[PDB]
Amino acid sequence: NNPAIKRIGNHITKSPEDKREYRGLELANGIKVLLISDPTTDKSSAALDVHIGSLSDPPNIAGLSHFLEHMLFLGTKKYPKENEYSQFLSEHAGSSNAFTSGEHTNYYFDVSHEHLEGALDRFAQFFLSPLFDESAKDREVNAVDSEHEKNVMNDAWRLFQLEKATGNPKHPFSKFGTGNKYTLETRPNQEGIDVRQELLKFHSAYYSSNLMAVVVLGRESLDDLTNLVVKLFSEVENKNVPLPEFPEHPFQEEHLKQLYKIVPIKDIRNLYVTFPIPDLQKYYKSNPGHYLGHLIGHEGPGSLLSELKSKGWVNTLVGGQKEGARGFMFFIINVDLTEEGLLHVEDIILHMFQYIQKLRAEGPQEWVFQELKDLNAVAFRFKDKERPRGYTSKIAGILHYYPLEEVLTAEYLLEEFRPDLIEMVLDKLRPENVRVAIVSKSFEGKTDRTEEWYGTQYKQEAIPDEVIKKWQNADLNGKFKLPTKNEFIPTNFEILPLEKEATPYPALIKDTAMSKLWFKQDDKFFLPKANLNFEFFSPFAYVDPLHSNMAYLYLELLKDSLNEYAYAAELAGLSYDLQNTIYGMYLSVKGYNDKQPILLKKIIEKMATFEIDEKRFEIIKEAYMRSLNNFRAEQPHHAMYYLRLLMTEVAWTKDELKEALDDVTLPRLKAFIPQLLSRLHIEALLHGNITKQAALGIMQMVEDTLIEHAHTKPLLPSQLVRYREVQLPDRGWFVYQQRNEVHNNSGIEIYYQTDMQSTSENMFLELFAQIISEPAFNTLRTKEQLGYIVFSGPRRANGIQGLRFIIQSEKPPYLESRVEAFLITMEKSIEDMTEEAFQKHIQALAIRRLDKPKKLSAESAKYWGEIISQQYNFDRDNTEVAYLKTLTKEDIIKFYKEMLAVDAPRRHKVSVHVLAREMNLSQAPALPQPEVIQNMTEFKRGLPLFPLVKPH
Amino acid sequence: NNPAIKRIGNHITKSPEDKREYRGLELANGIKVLLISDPTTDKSSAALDVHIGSLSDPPNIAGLSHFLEHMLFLGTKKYPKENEYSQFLSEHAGSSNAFTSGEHTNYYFDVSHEHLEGALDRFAQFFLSPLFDESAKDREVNAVDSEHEKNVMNDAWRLFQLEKATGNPKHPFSKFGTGNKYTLETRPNQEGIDVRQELLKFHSAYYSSNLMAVVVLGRESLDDLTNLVVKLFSEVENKNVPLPEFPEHPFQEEHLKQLYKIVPIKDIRNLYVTFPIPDLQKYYKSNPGHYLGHLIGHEGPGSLLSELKSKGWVNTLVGGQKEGARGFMFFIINVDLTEEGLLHVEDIILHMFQYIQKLRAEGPQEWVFQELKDLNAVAFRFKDKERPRGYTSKIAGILHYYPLEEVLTAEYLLEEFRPDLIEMVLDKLRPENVRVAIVSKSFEGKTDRTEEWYGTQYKQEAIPDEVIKKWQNADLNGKFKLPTKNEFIPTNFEILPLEKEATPYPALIKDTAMSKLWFKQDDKFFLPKANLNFEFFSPFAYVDPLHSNMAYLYLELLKDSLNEYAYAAELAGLSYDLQNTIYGMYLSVKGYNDKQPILLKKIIEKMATFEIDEKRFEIIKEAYMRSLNNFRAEQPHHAMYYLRLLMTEVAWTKDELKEALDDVTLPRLKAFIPQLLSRLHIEALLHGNITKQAALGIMQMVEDTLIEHAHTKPLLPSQLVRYREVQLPDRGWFVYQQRNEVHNNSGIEIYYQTDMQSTSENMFLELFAQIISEPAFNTLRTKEQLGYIVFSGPRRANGIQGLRFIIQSEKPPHYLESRVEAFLITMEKSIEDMTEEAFQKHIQALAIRRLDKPKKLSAESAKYWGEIISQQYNFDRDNTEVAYLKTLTKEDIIKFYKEMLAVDAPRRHKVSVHVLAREMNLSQAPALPQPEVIQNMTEFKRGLPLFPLVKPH
Ligand SMILES: [Zn+2]
Ligand SMILES: [Zn+2]
């Protein structure tokens, strides 16, 4: 054996169904590596995880470890061209990205399996000699600063950082993770530090091989992927860094029995109960936290959630162990509050302790643990094949925590039942060590403290002893039961053999006035699973604001009443999704095909005979009101929204929906339901491990239940229509504008309508999109630093398509001239790019479109698309790619001069401008003055609507 | 004195609101003449009525006098061009027509006021030197045969002739009016007749001056008009023809007590009860007929219709005197029948005699006469000014019947109260001389006779003698009472003073979420009337075919419920039109403004607190079902209908409505109403003898009433959708094809769609429309004789427009197309050849047509209502558009034709609808492209862009 490989991992315990081929190993220098050999993959992929992150930033430069992560993309000693990396990845059908936690910096990529070597080499250089270019450091600090601004008004982060800022300040937990202009440029300059150096020290100090794990997946044999990793990663230095432990919990004596009152941005009510605990990671084999999470989290009859829900105090609850770092964790129970629940916080919490007391009173349930084990065992036997890129990144992450031979199984299986540990953790959940946080708009004005980084308005009190004492005496309550034995565990996993009459694509197999049924027995994956998808068209779902509203409430309340029942099902890997659409309703049922009919029958049955509950109805309606209102507080790309509204024939606005909400009275909804159901068409796609005649019987029962309980009759053919896109005039240019009252950043979509989707008109657009893709990111973000979110690519809607640009910025939408200026740069670029450059792109688009589906639901979505889009072109990718391969540099250009260029005979252009709360480089073209859109419906009315697309 | 005039008559009595000046005179040769001077009129008119008609047809050339009427239009000695007259009229903003009843032939026209003299000259010649060209006679005989085919399968015509054919056949009344090709060309050639002689002979025999009345209306002084009429009509020859009289009734004592059982074309159910009466005409000062008419026909509490409808047997009823001819008349009482009703005819007729008995038992009522007299006197005082052509035609007719001084007032005012004439006519409504027809599909198969001219299937029977007896024995039935006093009779007639800041066009005086109120106070007509129009928007009334069904049903049951109470108001000259539209509902209240808010309020209250009778729901639905179904018997030129369906964004078919009509249960309607009414928006035009504030209150009162009782609130602005027209491809051509299963002609509509309506696009279209207007009629009908129904003109929908042709024909539509297409090339050439001055004539002709001032409130209203319902709000459109029209040149129209209309126009957009018959030289046609045959209406529409909606003003 090789002098550069300290050890070899074999065998690597994997799923019984998993045809990929694993060998792990430890290099001389101390890198733990997993290699995955998949001879049939279209995309190769690799990831590296360094066991350093945010929690190790020097205290005088918050965000350094995050910022470093941003920088390693921007050029290395071997490959100085600042975007050589991300250009290579896009010229060969690939993509890359990274992230930074408290203890991890994780970097991943994928690429056309044929250029795994190129990509990997470019990538290894991040860990050998990054340039940290002085002038690139100066630009990209803004990208980070943008990232932070985006999050400043997100409530999740406000809270995330708030927790950090209310524990021990001297603890590295309290650190600002994201960093920004002040932490990373302004303050270090004033403080006399040199940032580029500190990067380099940091990199040098912590990016040591003893702290890295690498996963590399490709088509190559295990032996070849070996010499390839060894060749590339043997050189990483081993600095021998000691791996950081944080053994002292950030919440000390004084940080406990504290109540926090917090003003949100959105109109949200929320309660965050939280207890500090020791680091349960080392007991991964028995997993006590998960066991107690399973119980406290449960949503079945007898659960905490149920009682709280039944008293009208909460809607949703999550609970379980929350990750901390090596040496400290959390156990949480969060709920959202109703109006009434906000008035009864002390009570809700007493109930939380009463549940906990029940568990103590009964002690550790072995059958419950056994159940959890067997569920996991099955989950794992029949795990879906992952997308390589995510797979490598995840795995590279967990190599730090498990022996090479155990990585695949490790975060899946549970092994010994450990009652003493369940009992040591449970004993940690008590009144005298709890932290409570309430979040509500009604604390507006009553706060005294502003959190430093986000500006969060809050107040902090000691929870009075009388209240803590009252919670310790929490007795049992006969409303709390342990869960009954999960009914929906699927016993039977037979894969039925491929039928004689079986097709490669879905066949239409029932075509009645009542229902069209697309069916395909699964020919690729061979798991005991099925996907059952149904649209139920009825004009009545979206005919008008009030009706949308009701179509929505109806499904929510239905889902809500069903949730106690469906939860056990969902745990047993059999789940469903049901929502309203613009056309009437959608229902998907996915999972193990064994208990699949039972649940389906329940859902249909239940919708057709639904008793609404007044109290329930009232809570949900109010939540929904708030939810509609809270949209004023999303991000500036809002831009996307208005674009949707402007371009579609029918589209109800939030303001419209919220006007009509006041007049959904209980009777009117009751009346609404059987009306909605009286006339329908059903288009279904049933894909997976079921047979032609089994499917027929499925569809049948579905229908029959409807005919029976809701007297459904078929809909008229003419009364079945799709909606249309607005047809923009030639050489025209409109601009609509709003403000965002909440984020002090601005946003913008620019939309270049082209024509109706066809083979050719699609590929022109797709390929142009391909070519510009990364130049777009490089010019608009990397060079010009217009903001953290910059985006280009196709827009497809109602059968029409165009090109879109999205940008979020500190700048005003100006943003336009830069997008227009860029666009000319692209004109010059195509005129100069070589034939062999050009054919690289065609090949990228090619591999990308033709990449085979990995799991059954990836493939169901592919036909779903075809079916709802009413195009039915199941062989699309082959036609389209064959045609693609015919396009010359000449064609693309002509397409550009005709449709996109500043002065195209046929340029159609809309631009949405969301202005902020408060409102050298290449040359921009002079633009016409736009016709400003004063009113949205007026806009639509004075313009043609395209045709609906014909069914190939 | 004057040789040419036998006498001027005295003051001609008029309403005192009638600003027109009038002279009646009798000419030397016996022509009774009325002359109207209106120095303000935009069009002038004249009419001539000849007291001869199809009752005087030779018995062996049926229809000859109808056919003569057709032929006076095609040439006289002084003006011999086959179409000189109809062309002179087109070129000077005139129209023209004629009709032939049993005893009259009536010829009328109008023209630009400037050209009354030349119009009239051309017209007098009809009565002096008609040519009856041999080669025109040959062609036009087909126009008559078409006219008749059209009537063959229509039910009213069939019944009309069937009554004529079961009277005494030896009687003139039994004749066949229209004639056809068989009777006017075939039968006479077989029997060696020269029709041109018999036309010439009949005209010479009967168009004699002693039997003629003339009315002429122009700006000219009354003297000027006198000189004119003397000039052109003194030379009409007086043959002193005895005026024919028909003393003996055709239903003699032998054709009485008959039951007739008729198989109808449409699925209808009807009973016609009919008694013969003497001629009541001479008794016009008292009107015994109309009094019993008014009584029997009443729809108020305690009336006949009222009980009959209560026992769920009948739905509507008419009754009164039907006109006969000099010598005979009829009294009729006709009902339609419910399903139950067809099985209780015997009882229904008894109820009729019970009511008649009541009238006999009560005596005649002078207080009822008195009511009738005032309603009439009020009606005449404040009668709306009539359009000149209708007016002259009408008077010309009634000059024969009444003294000169009395023409204007004779048909209106009452004078004498005659108990004895009432008793008299009321003694003739007895079972011993009754006639009874039941029309019903349930006699299909069971009928033993065929009426020669229409083919009508029927059976005839003596009414069982003790069925008569039982009706003779009808005692009074307590559900029947004479109507009480009529509280809706207006008394306040005060024209309000013309307000301080009032305006020439409607002003938007209210702009809320619930309503847009357009208001204009009358500044032209000064009659105590007002028009109140309302659109209720609710997308709910047309969301789906089912809801449309309810929109409709609801509205009918509501109209039905009110009927008993609204009827009173209607006789009081106060009426309402209420109906469902594609955008929710339309409600109009028209007439004497005095009691109007009483009625409007009753309508809104009712329609917002409605209780639906279970019985009347089941009945009306059955009737509505039939109605839908019955469209398959509507005329082939159906074509219009399929085109409306093919080009609107949204349209439910009669077939979808028919299907979805089964799932309209009583529970389900009861739900609909409150839903529909819950969110509305109202656009209204209140117009007339009302003040700003009076108007604002009316608008508010409507709103408020709905607010109270239907908890109504504002519709969201974006839910106020207008619909769109399908946008056709450049250079495309589609054909939809269907067949009419009842009718044995075929039909066609051709649409060359052009662009959106716009000042310029509109006048380009209208100008070309006008220029081709009569050449089209002349070519496609008169020369080519493709059919009776030949129409060309503009077509306006959902803010888009274009040129259309409708024809109804014997020939197939693959042939009609080619002749229209041929006419299109004939016309580009015509435009090319015509003098600049001939071109300006047409501009002027269209210009005048557009600028014609409205004569009555309802007409000005309509023009404003068009602006509003169409959301163009171009109230001054007529000067804007005319001003612009005067700019146009031959160049512009030629370019226009070549770019939009020509057979290979770069931008021709063509739809043709071909409706085939039950059973399926000349200028050069162009060779056509290959049509795309529209297969599925919905698919066709899905695959094409839609036009924008038009910008408001
Ligand atoms: Zn980042
Ligand atoms: Zn005629």
- Pair (B939, B830) in one structural domain: yes
Same domain? B823 vs B932: yes
Distance in Å, alpha carbon of B597 to nearest chain A alpha carbon: 32
Whether the CB-CB separation of B528 and B696 falls below 8 Å is answered with: no
**Coil, helix or strand at residue A465:** helix
The count of other CB atoms within 10 Å of the CB of residue B275 is 20
CB A928 within 8 A of CB B935: no
Looking at the partner chain, which of B652, B659, B948 has a beta carbon nearest the beta carbon of A941? B948
**Running DSSP on this structure, what letter comes out for residue B272?**
E
Residue A388's contacts (CB-CB under 8 Å, 6 or more residues apart) are A38, A41, A43, A44, A45, A110, A217
Mutant choice from B542, B719, B909, B932 vs A, greatest count of A C-beta within 10 A? B719
Cβ atoms of B210 and B29 within 8 Å: the answer is yes
Distance, first Cα to last Cα, chain A: 59
Given a contact cutoff of 8 angstroms between Cβ atoms, the answer to whether A325 and A173 are in contact is yes
**Which residues make Cβ contacts (< 8 Å) with residue B407, sequence separation at least 6?**
B12, B24, B34, B395, B398, B399
Helix (H) or strand (E) holding B259: strand B258-262
Which H or E run includes A397?
A: helix A388-398
- Selected catalytic residue, list A17, A69, A406, A451: A69
User: Are A874 and A907 found together in one domain?
Assistant: yes
Range of the domain at B934: 726-953
Per DSSP bridges, beta strands A21-26 and A32-37 are antiparallel
- Residue A107 within any structural domain of the chain: yes
Written as six digits, the tokens of A566 are 């469906």
Interface test with A, best of B677, B720, B946, B953 (most A CBs within 10 A): B946
Provide DSSP, A143-160: HHHHHHHHHHT-HHHHHH
Ligand nearest to the CA of A100: 1
Report the b/e string of B363-387 with b at 16+ CB within 10 A. Answer: ebbeebbebbbebbebebbbeebeb
Chain A residue closest in CA terms to B942: A948
Q: How far apart are CA A705 and CA B5, in angstroms?
A: 91
Residue B258 burial (CB < 10 Å; 0-12/13-18/19+)?
middle
Question: What gap in Å lies between CA B711 and CA A284, rounded to an integer?
Answer: 63
The verdict on A236 and A311 lying in the same domain is no
In a domain, B494, yes or no: no
Grouping H, G, I as helix, E, B as strand and the rest as coil, residue A390 is helix
Of residues B69, B220, B535, B725, which has the active-site annotation? B69
In a domain, B480, yes or no: no
Tokens in use for B940? 């066709």
Adjacent-strand bridge partners of B576: B589
Cα–ligand 1 centroid distance for A281 (angstroms): 27
Q: Are both A530 and A465 inside the same structural domain?
A: no
- Residues of chain A with Cβ-Cβ distance to B584 below 8 Å are none
Q: How far is residue B49's CA from residue B107's CA, in Å, rounded to a whole number?
A: 6
Distance spanning both ends of chain B, measured CA to CA: 61
Beta-sheet strand order (sheet of A43-50)? A7-9, A21-26, A32-37, A212-218, A43-50, A105-112, A95-100
The count of domains in chain A is 4
**Residues whose CB falls within 8 Å of the CB of residue B282, separated by 6 or more in sequence, listed in order:** none
B482 found inside a domain: no
Q: At what angle do helices B614-629 and B666-678 cross, to 10 degrees?
A: 90
Same domain, B737 and B855: yes
Q: Are residues A338 and A190 located together in one domain of the fold?
A: no
Question: Do residue A539 and residue B539 have CB atoms under 8 angstroms apart?
Answer: no
- Residue A11: asked if its preceding bond is cis (omega within 30°), the reply is yes
How would you classify the pairing of strands B713-714 and B679-688?
Answer: parallel
Residues B41, B39: Cα–Cα separation, whole Å: 6
Q: Are B302 and B479 in contact (CB under 8 A)?
A: yes
How are the residues of chain B apportioned to helix, strand and coil, as percentages rounded to the nearest 5? 45, 20, 35
Bridge-partner residues for B714, per DSSP?
Answer: B680
Ligand 2 centroid–CA B139 distance in Å is 14
How many residues are given for chain A? 952
Supply A271's token pair.
């309660």
SS3 category, B239: coil
Q: Collapsing DSSP states into helix, strand and coil, what is residue B414?
A: coil
- With tokens 């009525």, the residue in question is B49
Report the CATH number that the domain containing residue B428 is assigned in CATH.
3.30.830.10
Question: Same domain for A257 and A208?
Answer: no
The answer as to whether A492 is a domain residue is: no
**Residue ending a domain, choose from A725, A743, A765:** A725
Q: What residues contact residue B780 under an 8 Å CB cut-off, 6+ apart?
A: B786, B790, B805, B807, B819, B820, B823
Single out the residue of B318, B351, B328, B364 nearest to residue B431, CA to CA: B351
Counting ligands in written order, which one lies closest to the CA of residue B144? 2
User: Which of A787, A545, A736, A743 shows the shortest CA–CA distance to A632?
Assistant: A743
Ion ligand 2 neighbours, Cβ < 5 Å: B 147
Torsion of CA B281, B284, B287, B288, to 10 degrees: -50
Sign, CA torsion A634/A640/A645/A650? negative
Are A724 and B656 within 8 A, CB to CB? no
Domain end: A214, A243, A272, which one? A243
B920/chain A closest Cα distance in angstroms:
29
Contact A940, A726 (CB under 8 A): yes
CA atoms within a 13 Å half-sphere pointing along the CA-CB vector of A938: 9
- Note whether A10 and A109 are same-domain residues: yes
CA angle B669, B673, B674 (to 5 degrees): 125
Per-position DSSP letters for A553-573, written without gaps between them: HHHHHHHHHHHHHHHHHHHTT
Question: What does the alpha-carbon distance between residue B355 and residue B609 come to, in Å, rounded to a whole number?
Answer: 34
Q: Which long-range contacts (CB under 8 A, 24 or more apart) does B848-853 make?
A: B848/B42, B848/B43, B848/B93, B848/B112, B849/B93, B849/B770, B850/B766, B850/B878, B850/B881, B850/B882, B850/B885, B851/B42, B851/B878, B851/B879, B851/B882, B852/B42, B852/B43, B853/B40, B853/B42, B853/B524
Helix (H) or strand (E) holding B592: strand B584-592
Long-range contact set of residues A731-734: C-beta below 8 Å, sequence gap at least 24: A731/A904, A731/A905, A731/A906, A731/A907, A732/A907, A732/A908, A732/A909, A732/A931, A733/A907, A733/A909, A733/A910, A733/A911, A733/A927, A733/A928, A733/A930, A733/A931, A734/A909, A734/A910, A734/A911, A734/A930, A734/A931, A734/A932, A734/A933, A734/A939
Q: Which residue type is seen at A705?
A: T
Sign of CA dihedral B668, B671, B677, B678: negative
- 3-class SS at A422? helix
In this structure, the number of other CB atoms found within 10 A of the CB of residue B902 comes to 18
In single-letter form, the type of residue at position B826 comes to T
The answer to the question of residue A380 being in a domain is yes
Please report residues of B whose CB lies closer than 8 A to that of A652.
718
Asked whether the beta carbons of B772 and B820 are under 8 A apart, the reply is no
Paired with A276 in beta bridges are A330
- d(CA A948, nearest CA chain B) in Å: 5
Q: How many angstroms separate the Cα of B568 from the Cα of each of B483, B555, B574, B602, B656?
A: 9, 20, 9, 13, 38
Are A905 and A783 in the same domain?
yes
Distances (CA, A) of A716 to A533, A722, B881, B888, B938: 22, 14, 44, 49, 11
A469: which residues sit within 8 A by CB, 6+ positions away? A431
Resolution in units of Å: 3.2
**A877 lies in some domain:** yes
Residues of chain A contacting B678 with CB distance shorter than 8 Å: 663
Q: Are B813 and B915 in contact (CB under 8 A)?
A: yes
Within a domain: A489: no
* d(C-alpha B757, C-alpha B766), whole Å: 11
- The answer to whether the beta carbons of residues B824 and B924 sit under 8 Å apart is no
Residue A69 is among the residues annotated as catalytic for this protein: yes
Round to whole Å and give the CA distance between B339 and A204. 99
Contact list in A for residue B657 (CB cut-off 8 A) is none
The per-residue b/e assignment along B649-667, b for 16 or more CB within 10 angstroms, e otherwise, is bebbbbebbbebbeebeee
The answer to whether B916 touches B813, Cβ cutoff 8 Å, is: yes
Q: Are A132 and A71 in contact (CB under 8 A)?
A: yes
Angle in degrees, CA B508, B513, B517, rounded to 5: 25
Interface residues on A facing B, Cβ-Cβ cutoff 8 A: 539-540, 543-546, 652-653, 656, 659-660, 663, 671, 675, 678-679, 713, 716-719, 721-722, 724, 727, 936-937, 941-948, 950
Domain stops at, among A211, A243, A275: A243
- Say whether both B823 and B860 belong to one domain: yes
- Among the partner residues A544, A660, A946, nearest to B539 by beta-carbon distance: A544
- Are A65 and A168 part of one and the same domain? yes
A84 by Cβ neighbours in 10 Å (0-12 / 13-18 / 19+) ranks as middle
Residue of A721, A722, A947 lying closest to B944 (CB–CB):
A947
CA–centroid distance, A50 to ligand 1, in Å, is 16
Whether residue A804 contacts residue A776, with contact meaning beta carbons closer than 8 Å, is answered with no
